Amino acid sequence: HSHGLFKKLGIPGPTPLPFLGNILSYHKGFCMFDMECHKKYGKVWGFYDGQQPVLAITDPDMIKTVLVKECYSVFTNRRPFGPVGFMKSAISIAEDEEWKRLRSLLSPTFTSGKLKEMVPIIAQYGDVLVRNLRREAETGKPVTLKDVFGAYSMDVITSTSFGVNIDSLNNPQDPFVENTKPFFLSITVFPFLIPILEVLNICVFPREVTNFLRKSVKRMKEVDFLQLMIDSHKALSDLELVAQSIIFIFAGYETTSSVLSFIMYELATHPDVQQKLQEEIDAVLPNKAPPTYDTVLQMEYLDMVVNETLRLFPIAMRLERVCKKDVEINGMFIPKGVVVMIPSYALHRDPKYWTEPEKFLPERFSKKNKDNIDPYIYTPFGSGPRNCIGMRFALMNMKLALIRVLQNFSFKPCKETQIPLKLSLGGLLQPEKPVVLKVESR
Amino acid sequence: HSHGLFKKLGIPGPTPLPFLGNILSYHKGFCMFDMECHKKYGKVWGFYDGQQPVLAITDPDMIKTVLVKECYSVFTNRRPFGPVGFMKSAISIAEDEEWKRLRSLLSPTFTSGKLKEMVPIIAQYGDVLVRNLRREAETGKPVTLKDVFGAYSMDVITSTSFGVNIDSLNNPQDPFVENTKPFFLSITVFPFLIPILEVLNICVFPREVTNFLRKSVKRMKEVDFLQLMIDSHKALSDLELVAQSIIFIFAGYETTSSVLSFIMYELATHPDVQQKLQEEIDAVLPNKAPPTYDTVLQMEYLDMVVNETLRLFPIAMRLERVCKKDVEINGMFIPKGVVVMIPSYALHRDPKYWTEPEKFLPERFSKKNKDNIDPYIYTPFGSGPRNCIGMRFALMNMKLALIRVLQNFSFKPCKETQIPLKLSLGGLLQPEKPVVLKVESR
Ligand code: HEM
Ligand code: HEM
């Protein structure tokens, strides 16, 4: 019974119920729970996800020690999440030296150099998105953004991760990679059923599939994510490689469409920001000019708009590292086995570092005010050696969509637009009611 | 499904059934399974304890690399065995740096210096054993050795581990440490139920107890094992210390009585060895002289008799280390997660190193022939930094019993003496039928 651990350490927090710990406080959601705890417990508190003790920290230096200084020595891994099956070779799930090999093998694929060779490939789908937007524009009636953006996020993945060009919004039959579409609550209070479903062949990812991917990869041994990984420690195995693109499809999909929905909701409800961004868009790219890699990395107000939306909506919500051994960081003692948690959502909306945190103010990241931001309070992609490996790709993918989207259309709220936006009560950080807006052709 | 691992590595072995692996081959027992496998597969083979892949090695250099060379780097831990409860602080169960601290904290207690301060304390029970033997000697009828030796092994533990002096054979009511008295088969094919019974408070050791020990240890904060540990990295905690003596009581009990039963069975069926040992006993200790520390370490034939019995009956049977990372030792590749097993029983009875291995021949360890023995074939106490930490204590404890036992009595087989001795079909290495012999007063 480790429920007395934090009170044995003099660490405040909510009192854990036997078995459950503090998981019943998730009736408000992961984000609201961390906000309340950050408000009433101070810089550090502890809670129990079932029997698993979790230590939350909000100190920048302590976060720097966890994410960067003592990454390879102590805080190398995240905690296990469920029956992983063969997906234990995924870079986000691999641990210790086995992860170190994967990160070193996959680092070249996400260079700024490889990113520029992909800009024309995904700008092609920045055109396809407008093609499906002009449809729901002269039709003159609101649009569910997660459909067109979800189609866009699906089109870019497939062609960048496999070279398979599709119009996912206009070819819904061909299910090339439909491989994506009350468990994890139980699996947490009951982490002992994780290895049960392992031997049971029960995978959290639909396991009867993959078989289509490895056998369709048999088509690739004999510019995209696949071809960049084949060229390559020892080389990437057949299966090991397959696991990465699956983690790439999961990572590239739900993230792109949800954030793009968050950005467009902010832009529509802040037409001044939308107009100022559209002017910078029109200025840098005169006369609906095609966006390029070097142009995207010049639109300063676009970068500020993206970074501020990710501050309000860090879709990962939390950062977690497992304490591999009894250590003593920045003045306090962390026992082995404790999950160290960094509440990115709570920190991003902390008045100790942000003025009017609920306000969408892109000028926070201006070249005047950007230098005053602590790189460990603002962690939408994490930090350290185990940060978001596809950060530059994700930002470039979303910016290339927003430019072509705003080069042609302006967006306004509707009677159906959920104002204010309510965040999802589940665990992914999406809009409760999906975002619907009016799309006017310029 | 890791059952294709060894055939993917070009490693011979028995074909694993789904779920079960090769555990159905344990109908013969752990020892017979390793003997057959060592006979038909060569130096190295692989099998599956359920889904857990186990690699067996019989090469001395490879054993030296596993037990000694790459102990702290790769092969630091044994594999988990079941729901451990609070017994994860036991030195035999602790892992990595947490074990490194315990071994360094408990190393002084098992010095040859601390052992001499305990010789008079346990020689007192070498007297009590004869006291209960002279009873079943003038009564003139056979004796179940595991009762008097089990009583002896219980008396020495209590007084050395707690200073509590009892005659366990004559005070059976006072259950001071009765804390000792179709699961592990299931727990192996189903290693996923290990953490189930953890949250269920189900401990493999009777958990309602301990409470008598920690609260009776409350009696010790304010020469024995307890007092030697209190004097003491950071110090040993209250609970951490309690877990050690429990592992000490388990380790000191079933081992001492079973081996003493093995020794006396060998001595009775080899009266020449018994007579030659009794002569050396009479010569070094004239006229039933009291044994001392310095005398025990002089009886060369006693040491050879003990070492040869442990060759025929290494009660631990196997040596196991977990492969913590993908490594390449002495020419072959060991993937992370594979349990590396050293069959001590199979190696001790290998004609490649032992002539007439089934024969009890104490002269194998004579100062002429002792030097020809490989320290990694003969591993009754293991080897390397994680060998049997109570080796010198166990040997001294048994030798001190045998001397006083043979200073007064000679032992002969009976009509009930199971000749030849059949080994147990369970998993502890004990006689199938308990050893019963005639005890004659000299
Ligand atoms: C808006 C989009 C995205 C956001 C906000 C985001 C955010 C994050 C965060 C916060 C982490 C944890 C980092 C840490 O704990 O230090 C992470 C990990 C990761 N992300 Fe993303 N991500 C996004 C898109 C992507 C994309 C497009 C890819 C790949 C194509 C990707 C691949 C990964 C991987 C592989 C990891 C695990 C890295 C490791 O374990 O070494 N992510 N991401
Ligand atoms: C005839 C008596 C005994 C025999 C044959 C024996 C044999 C062994 C063997 C083979 C190992 C495994 C070593 C390895 O894997 O390298 C071991 C471990 C161990 N033994 Fe014994 N043992 C005996 C008695 C004892 C006694 C009397 C104690 C304590 C009072 C003890 C305490 C331990 C401990 C704590 C370990 C684990 C060490 C670690 O994990 O670091 N044993 N023993």
Swiss-Prot record, chains A, B:
Q: Which disease is it linked to?
A: Vitamin D-dependent rickets 3: An autosomal dominant disorder of vitamin D metabolism resulting in early-onset rickets, reduced serum levels of the vitamin D metabolites 25-hydroxyvitamin D and 1,25-dihydroxyvitamin D, and deficient responsiveness to parent and activated forms of vitamin D.
Record organism: Homo sapiens (Human)
By what means is the activity of this protein regulated?
Answer: Activated by cytochrome b5.
Single GO term (MF): vitamin D3 25-hydroxylase activity
User: Is the keyword Metal-binding in the record?
Assistant: yes
Describe what happens upon changing V143I: In allele CYP3A4*9
Other facts: Chimeric transcripts, characterized by CYP3A43 exon 1 joined at canonical splice sites to distinct sets of CYP3A4 exons, have been detected. All are possibly produced by trans-splicing. The chimeric transcripts exist in 3 different combinations: CYP3A43 exon 1 joined in frame to CYP3A4 exons 2-13, CYP3A43 exon 1 joined in frame to CYP3A4 exons 4-13 and CYP3A43 exon 1 joined in frame to CYP3A4 exon 7-13. The longest chimeric isoform (CYP3A43 exon 1 joined to CYP3A4 exons 2-13) exhibits 6-beta-hydroxylase activity, while a shorter isoform (CYP3A43 exon 1 joined to CYP3A4 exons 4-13) does not.
Q: Where in the cell is it found?
A: Endoplasmic reticulum membrane; Microsome membrane
Q: Name the Pfam families on file.
A: p450
Q: Which gene encodes it?
A: CYP3A4
Binding positions (heme): C388
Q: Which GO terms describe its biological process?
A: aflatoxin metabolic process; alkaloid catabolic process; androgen metabolic process; cholesterol metabolic process; estrogen metabolic process; lipid hydroxylation; lipid metabolic process; long-chain fatty acid biosynthetic process
Tissue-specificity statement = Expressed in prostate and liver. According to some authors, it is not expressed in brain. According to others, weak levels of expression are measured in some brain locations. Also expressed in epithelium of the small intestine and large intestine, bile duct, nasal mucosa, kidney, adrenal cortex, epithelium of the gastric mucosa with intestinal metaplasia, gallbladder, intercalated ducts of the pancreas, chief cells of the parathyroid and the corpus luteum of the ovary (at protein level).
Q: What does this protein do?
A: A cytochrome P450 monooxygenase involved in the metabolism of sterols, steroid hormones, retinoids and fatty acids. Mechanistically, uses molecular oxygen inserting one oxygen atom into a substrate, and reducing the second into a water molecule, with two electrons provided by NADPH via cytochrome P450 reductase (NADPH--hemoprotein reductase). Catalyzes the hydroxylation of carbon-hydrogen bonds.
Q: What is its EC number?
A: 1.14.14.1, 1.14.14.56, 1.14.14.73, 1.14.14.55
The cross-references to CDD domains, in alphabetical order and at most eight, read: CYP3A
Q: Which InterPro entries match?
A: Cyt_P450, Cyt_P450_CS, Cyt_P450_E_CYP3A, Cyt_P450_E_grp-II, Cyt_P450_sf, Cytochrome_P450_3A
- The name under which this protein is listed is Cytochrome P450 3A4
Q: What's the impact of mutating P413S?
A: In allele CYP3A4*19
Q: What effect on the protein does mutating M391T have, as reported in its record? A: In allele CYP3A4*3
